[PDB]
Amino acid sequence: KAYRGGHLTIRLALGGCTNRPFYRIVAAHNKCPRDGRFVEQLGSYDPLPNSHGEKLVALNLDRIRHWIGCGAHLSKPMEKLLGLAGFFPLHPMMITNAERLRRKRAREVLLASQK
Amino acid sequence: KKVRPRLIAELARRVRALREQLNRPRDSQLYAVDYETLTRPFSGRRLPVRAWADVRRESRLLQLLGRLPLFGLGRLVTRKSWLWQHDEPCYWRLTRVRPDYTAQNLDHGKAWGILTFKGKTESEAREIEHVMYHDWRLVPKHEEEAFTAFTPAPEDSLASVPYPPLLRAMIIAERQKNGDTSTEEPMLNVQRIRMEPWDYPAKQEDKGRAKG
Amino acid sequence: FFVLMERYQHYRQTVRALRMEFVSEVQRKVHEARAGVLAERKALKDAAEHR
Amino acid sequence: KNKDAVRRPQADPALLTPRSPVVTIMGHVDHGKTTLLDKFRKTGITQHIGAFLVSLPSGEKITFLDTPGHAAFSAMRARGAQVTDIVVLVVAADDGVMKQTVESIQHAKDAQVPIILAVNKCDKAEADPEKVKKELLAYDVVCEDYGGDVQAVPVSALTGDNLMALAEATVALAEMLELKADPNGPVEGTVIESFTDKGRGLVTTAIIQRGTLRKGSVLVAGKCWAKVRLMFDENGKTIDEAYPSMPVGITGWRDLPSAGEEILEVESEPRAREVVDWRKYEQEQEKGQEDLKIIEEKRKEHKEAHQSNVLSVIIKGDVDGSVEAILNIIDTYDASHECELELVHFGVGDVSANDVNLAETFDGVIYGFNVNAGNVIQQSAAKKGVKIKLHKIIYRLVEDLQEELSSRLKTSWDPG
RNA sequence: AUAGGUUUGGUCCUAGCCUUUCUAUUAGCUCUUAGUAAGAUUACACAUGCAAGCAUCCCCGUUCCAGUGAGUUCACCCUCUAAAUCACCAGAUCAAAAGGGACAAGCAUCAAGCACGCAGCAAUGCAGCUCAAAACGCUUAGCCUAGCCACACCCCCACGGGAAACAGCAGUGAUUAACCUUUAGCAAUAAACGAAAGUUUAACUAAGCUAUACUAACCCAGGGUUGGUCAAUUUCGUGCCAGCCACCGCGGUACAC
Numbered sequence A: 001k002a003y004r005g006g007h008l009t010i011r012l013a014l015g016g017c018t019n020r021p022f023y024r025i026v027a028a029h030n031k032c033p034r035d036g037r038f039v040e041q042l043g044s045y046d047p048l049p050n051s052h053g054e055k056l057v058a059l060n061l062d063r064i065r066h067w068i069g070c071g072a073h074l075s076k077p078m079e080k081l082l083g084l085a086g087f088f089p090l091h092p093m094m095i096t097n098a099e100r101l102r103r104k105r106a107r108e109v110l111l112a113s114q115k
Numbered sequence B: 001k002k003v004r005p006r007l008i009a010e011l012a013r014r015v016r017a018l019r020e021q022l023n024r025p026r027d028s029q030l031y032a033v034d035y036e037t038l039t040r041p042f043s044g045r046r047l048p049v050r051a052w053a054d055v056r057r058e059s060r061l062l063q064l065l066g067r068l069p070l071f072g073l074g075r076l077v078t079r080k081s082w083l084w085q086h087d088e089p090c091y092w093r094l095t096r097v098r099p100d101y102t103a104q105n106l107d108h109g110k111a112w113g114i115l116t117f118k119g120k121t122e123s124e125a126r127e128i129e130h131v132m133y134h135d136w137r138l139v140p141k142h143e144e145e146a147f148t149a150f151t152p153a154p155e156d157s158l159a160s161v162p163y164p165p166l167l168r169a170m171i172i173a174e175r176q177k178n179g180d181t182s183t184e185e186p187m188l189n190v191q192r193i194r195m196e197p198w199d200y201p202a203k204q205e206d207k208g209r210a211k212g
Numbered sequence C: 001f002f003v004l005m006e007r008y009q010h011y012r013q014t015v016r017a018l019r020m021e022f023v024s025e026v027q028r029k030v031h032e033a034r035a036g037v038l039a040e041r042k043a044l045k046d047a048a049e050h051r
Numbered sequence D: 001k002n003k004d005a006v007r008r009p010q011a012d013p014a015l016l017t018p019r020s021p022v023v024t025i026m027g028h029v030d031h032g033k034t035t036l037l038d039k040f041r042k043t044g045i046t047q048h049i050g051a052f053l054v055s056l057p058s059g060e061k062i063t064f065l066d067t068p069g070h071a072a073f074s075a076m077r078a079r080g081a082q083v084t085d086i087v088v089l090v091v092a093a094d095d096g097v098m099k100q101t102v103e104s105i106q107h108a109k110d111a112q113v114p115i116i117l118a119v120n121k122c123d124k125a126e127a128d129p130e131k132v133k134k135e136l137l138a139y140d141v142v143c144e145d146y147g148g149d150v151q152a153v154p155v156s157a158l159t160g161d162n163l164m165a166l167a168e169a170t171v172a173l174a175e176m177l178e179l180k181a182d183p184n185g186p187v188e189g190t191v192i193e194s195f196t197d198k199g200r201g202l203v204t205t206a207i208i209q210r211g212t213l214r215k216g217s218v219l220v221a222g223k224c225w226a227k228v229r230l231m232f233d234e235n236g237k238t239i240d241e242a243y244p245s246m247p248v249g250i251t252g253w254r255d256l257p258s259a260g261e262e263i264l265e266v267e268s269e270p271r272a273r274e275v276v277d278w279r280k281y282e283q284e285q286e287k288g289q290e291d292l293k294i295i296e297e298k299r300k301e302h303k304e305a306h307q308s309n310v311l312s313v314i315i316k317g318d319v320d321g322s323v324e325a326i327l328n329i330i331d332t333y334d335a336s337h338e339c340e341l342e343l344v345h346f347g348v349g350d351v352s353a354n355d356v357n358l359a360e361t362f363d364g365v366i367y368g369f370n371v372n373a374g375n376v377i378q379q380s381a382a383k384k385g386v387k388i389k390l391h392k393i394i395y396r397l398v399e400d401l402q403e404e405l406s407s408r409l410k411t412s413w414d415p416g
Numbered sequence E: 001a002u003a004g005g006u007u008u009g010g011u012c013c014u015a016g017c018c019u020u021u022c023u024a025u026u027a028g029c030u031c032u033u034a035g036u037a038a039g040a041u042u043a044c045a046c047a048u049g050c051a052a053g054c055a056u057c058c059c060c061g062u063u064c065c066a067g068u069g070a071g072u073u074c075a076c077c078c079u080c081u082a083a084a085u086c087a088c089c090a091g092a093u094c095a096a097a098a099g100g101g102a103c104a105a106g107c108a109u110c111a112a113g114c115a116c117g118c119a120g121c122a123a124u125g126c127a128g129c130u131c132a133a134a135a136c137g138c139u140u141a142g143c144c145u146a147g148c149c150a151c152a153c154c155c156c157c158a159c160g161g162g163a164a165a166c167a168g169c170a171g172u173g174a175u176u177a178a179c180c181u182u183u184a185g186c187a188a189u190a191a192a193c194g195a196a197a198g199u200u201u202a203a204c205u206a207a208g209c210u211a212u213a214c215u216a217a218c219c220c221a222g223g224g225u226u227g228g229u230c231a232a233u234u235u236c237g238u239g240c241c242a243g244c245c246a247c248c249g250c251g252g253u254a255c256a257c
Ligand SMILES: Nc1nc2c(ncn2[C@@H]2O[C@H](COP(=O)(O)OP(=O)(O)OP(=O)(O)O)[C@@H](O)[C@H]2O)c(=O)[nH]1
Pocket: D028, D029, D030, D031, D032, D033, D034, D035, D036, D044, D045, D046, D047, D068, D069, D070, D120, D121, D122, D123, D124, D155, D156, D157, D158, D159
């Protein structure tokens, strides 16, 4: 389908079954469907803890670098995954959400102590 | 393989092109605002909530330049948003002006100037963006020296930043593999990157225009 | 709000630097594979073997 | 295993709560019942039994069931009498007690519903309410005038005179009756009419009798079931609830229930489907017994042996009640000897390609009562030689049917 | 195919038909639970509700997602090179228009098409080009499925006209043997927008209905068949009638009804 405009994006395509999410890190044209045609599958991501309490993420770092060079954008979840991986800096929103969680738990603890 | 030619397609395409060209709306129509309901009558689309106060209480660039000889050519024009969001002098030099002559009061138009953002003057003149925006103010001839007298800040910015953990590890491992045993820390140069503030004017030349 | 603005500024600076580096690496790889010593040596070897 | 869903046992005295009254305005043709209803609602033949939830100046709410007065709609009048709990008979003293007036009186007697006489057109000359009461004496409606219980009210629906007294009498009789019903639990009601809207599907205008109806309920009636999809009023505005004695139009009907059928709420869609299957199986057993007797007769005959002027009619109506009325008029045919009348197919809805195909197959005529036939249907009918006859009035349609019967022959059948 | 039944008075050969296997739709009879998957027959007509905003005004998007299969060798390869991304450029990626090649099924009782070619700068000249190795023509079909092509009410197109558009989600009438909710939230991913917190999204997610299927369970089993092919019938009733059969066949006082 001849798309006007658009641009490559490295993003998560949701596969899996109901109640069982699973993501394929695919470098795809942004206008293309979420789970549709993709230029290249750069990795995978299982968001459910496995028997060892792990969320397995596989990042084809070489091709990810090649596509970032070739001019592909990064969706926010992919940016946060890379930030956790240390391939990127931690996302400003990850940091701010961590601080928000710290403040929220602090309020909860303070109220529990008071009551 | 040869298909029946689609003559009507081309006919309609050219006709629509000509109609658009000949009926392109005028700035007076595109940038007209209903101060009572805060909607643009031409399209009937409300303006963002945050801009209501400015629309009600501030004047446009050509609105100011309608009360100046040569339409204020050669004067410095500033913005309320810039004045609020910065301490350094922010203003355009306003080399050229072309008002919207059909306007009842000539308060819409198209301007060209040289920007002085945060006290750094560009090396050329280019078009003024956000002319239709309601946050504008005129720099008076007097007090202009006080306004535009700026003392540059030191340019000591971090030339390099640490690599992200994993990238640094990979770089070091690759170097050791190659054979070098130098312990110099990998660093990421950031001088080639200049972080323009998010309110730096864009290129009105490439900015598009609303259609009819 | 201010802290987040500063964080985003620094983050985008660093990410743009990284993206510049990756773009440079991609360009260098393609440049090499196209017109590098190894590639030209292989081409010349093929031509000489053919002759 | 019997899976039928039956009406819940009579409500407990404690569970009982006051409810509105249900009034049916019966009477013979053109005695101003429609005018009286319009005056009460603050807003020339009736052909539909219409339910309206009116609010009186006292603040009370009363459900009025305006019924047709024509002789044809005896079924509609009987259904209205059965569902309602008060019969405000309307009689024009100038015209006097008539055949349909007596029919309504008998229906009220059967239903065991208090009757209130409203003398209509009392403004006009020759109006003799005393004579009306006297004549009613013969038909057992002993007006309070002649030492009785029935309240007679002189009114002039056109001029709106004494209607306040009529409403006051109705309210007083309602309070005396002390009508109450359980507002909670599974809903119970009766279908007042059913039809097919091109937008809303199969709809049924019903009157709730118990419980409260709400969107998402599962209802069963006859061989039909529904998941209540849209509950609407006379004016179509959606209503979130339908308390007892509330007229409500219910959408979401999988099948079009027969008029007057009981609607009972069940637990779930699977339970409703089980109930419908069981009811269909019961009907199948009954029809199977009938067919078994017929087949046994035929087989005995075969074993012992081993030892034209016909009018085919398709009927399409706007509502099931209208279709039933036309069917009764047809069944009153008695001149089969000179010409036979055959009913190929009856249904509710605009003339459809299936109706046209049946007409073509049986050389039939389509009679559409208050229904349309799109230009596509008209073109197909012209192409296939079918004749569509769209009538908006029952007696006009009956006249046309008689004319066709004579053309086949005048027809000896008198509708009466 | 590991084959079987069937031509005949009988054998052999050829041969069609049917059986056995596996799916899918519909129908009859019947049915307990949980998880998942899939789900109008129709390019016929649509009530109603929603499905595109964002944002300090401009711009950007609403050309995407989503849908249907009417039409149908526009999909794949190469050449060239638009638009878009790579904060600017860089060449890199992506991919249009154009040009070259490849590209469904049947009908030859569709065998001729009728300008379908070439040269010349031009003028103009030559009379050529496709075809029994299937041209031209008719009918049918969405395809080569990480998905792709095509259509977007019809007039191929859509200035113009007919007319007032669900082939977006839910739903409806008609139609067919064929028939899912007129649910909830953007919490996750995707998209749009913004510098950003964030907002929007009938995409999507999580639910609703359906033995259509797979998995698991069930302490309440129905359906079909019982002459042979083909697992499996006791006694009655009927008596070439009623009836039964996928093929062979049965029923004239029955392991076939
Ligand atoms: N003079 C007079 N006329 C009245 C009065 N009330 C009603 N009418 C008229 O009498 C007629 C009554 O007929 P409707 O009630 O409309 O109809 P109907 O009784 O169903 O009769 P059909 O529909 O023909 O069976 C109408 O013309 C009314 O307007 C009244 O009080 N006085």
